[PDB]
């Protein structure tokens, strides 16, 4: 019932290879729906999900202009950052940001976000109050000062409480057949001897959406946290995700182990055995 919209910006400098590349992608939950790439033959905001395609030419023009403006702003920010850190013109640097809204099940704003990282390090972030900033260091304190004078937080708050929520709600309605459909995991357990006296039990979850899932192994009802090998949830490429969890078990003791699966798409949580 909870949903979120998030835009992700990345600018990457590349001395000797032209101006910094700028990319934006936008997501509702785990679904990419729009992209922009300054390195594109003809840079524009482009649809990446069928439900956004119905937005008109005016939408795409405005969204594209925003991205073109951002390309320029982010390049200027990278120049500023280099100076803030006394860095040479030689190296390549990354500036990232993400912003957007989380709704609770009731469909009202639950939390807003607007935050930045430089070279993979948190730099500055809008606080949950949508009125103040947390700056990581003395460089970000400079940015904080400029943003307080520019009333940036007020702009974010207004966008986050208004436009962001309204359009996310619009997107959810337009894409409800997918965005509001949870697809449960298809699950099974495999068994692979490692030696004469131990075997791997692997619990599989496939074809699920959204990405959030819990997979655990129990031995005699007790959680096997430290002894469970869990892989990162991974995209299948058809919008769905996959995950597995494995434990090494003594030969003959397999019946002591249970796999437990929980996911939004499931009527009831599952308990699996080999």
């Amino acid at each position: 019932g909870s949903h979120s919209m998030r835009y992700f910006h990345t600018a990457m400098s590349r001395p000797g290879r032209g101006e910094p590349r700028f990319i934006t992608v936008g997501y509702v939950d785990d679904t990419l729906f729009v992209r922009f790439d300054s390195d594109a033959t003809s840079p524009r905001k482009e649809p990446r999900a069928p439900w956004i395609e119905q937005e008109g030419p005016e939408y795409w023009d405005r969204e594209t202009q925003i991205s073109k403006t951002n390309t320029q702003t982010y390049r200027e920010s990278l120049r500023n950052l280099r100076g803030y850190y006394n860095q040479s013109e030689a190296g390549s640097h990354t500036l990232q940001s993400m912003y957007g809204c989380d709704l609770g099940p009731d469909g009202r704003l639950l939390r807003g976000h607007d935050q930045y990282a430089y070279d993979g390090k948190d730099y500055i972030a809008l606080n949950e109050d949508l009125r103040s900033w947390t700056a990581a260091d003395t460089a970000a304190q400079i940015t904080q000062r400029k943003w307080e004078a520019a009333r940036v937080a007020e702009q974010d708050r207004a966008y986050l409480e208004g436009t962001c929520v309204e359009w996310l709600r619009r997107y959810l309605e337009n894409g409800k057949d997918t965005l509001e459909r949870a697809d449960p995991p298809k699950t099974h357990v495999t068994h692979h001897p490692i030696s004469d006296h131990e075997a791997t039990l692997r619990c599989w979850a496939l074809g699920f959406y959204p990405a959030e899932i819990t997979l655990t192994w129990q031995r005699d009802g007790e959680d096997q946290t430290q002894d469970t090998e869990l892989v990162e949830t991974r995209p299948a490429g058809d919008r769905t995700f996959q995950k597995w969890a494995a434990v090494v078990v003594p030969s003959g003791e397999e019946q002591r182990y249970t796999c437990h699966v929980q996911h939004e798409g499931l009527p009831k949580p599952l308990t699996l055995r080999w």
């Binding site: 936008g26 969204e63 925003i66 403006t69 702003t73 500023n80 730099y123 400029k146 520019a150």
Partner: peptide, 11 residues
């Protein structure tokens, strides 16, 4: 829909 930001939020 993105936020209509400008150069006043350059870092």
């Amino acid at each position: 829909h993105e936020e209509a930001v400008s150069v006043d939020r350059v870092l």
